[PDB]
């Protein structure tokens, strides 16, 4: 039901791949997010995971909802305020609660 994920991220150059992609965010259209449960559910989910990625190893899932990042309330937030708490230049390991 609820598992808490930690993430290390992968240097490969000025970059840190997370080997997975997320869809949802209040700024998004719940019918467009494959994994939201209605049309009311704008969270963020796991829509994509790379596999061998950092993200698998940790044991993120696809559908997996991300309520935490580092701590960080995701359950009211925009995709793109998401997609900056995991994509942190200055943060090489990212926590990750999510559902299931």
Do not use: C
């Not at 995971?49 to 937030?77: C, F, H, R």
């Amino acid at each position: 039901v609820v598992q808490r994920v930690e993430i290390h991220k992968l240097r490969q150059g000025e970059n840190l791949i997370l080997g997975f992609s997320i869809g949802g965010g209040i700024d998004q259209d719940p019918s467009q997010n494959p994994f939201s449960e209605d049309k009311t559910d704008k969270g963020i989910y796991v829509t994509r995971v790379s596999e061998g990625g950092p993200a698998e190893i940790a044991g993120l899932q696809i559908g997996d909802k991300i309520m935490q990042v580092n701590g960080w309330d995701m359950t009211m937030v925009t995709h793109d305020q998401a997609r900056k708490r995991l994509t942190k230049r200055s943060e090489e390991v990212v926590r990750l609660l999510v559902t299931r």
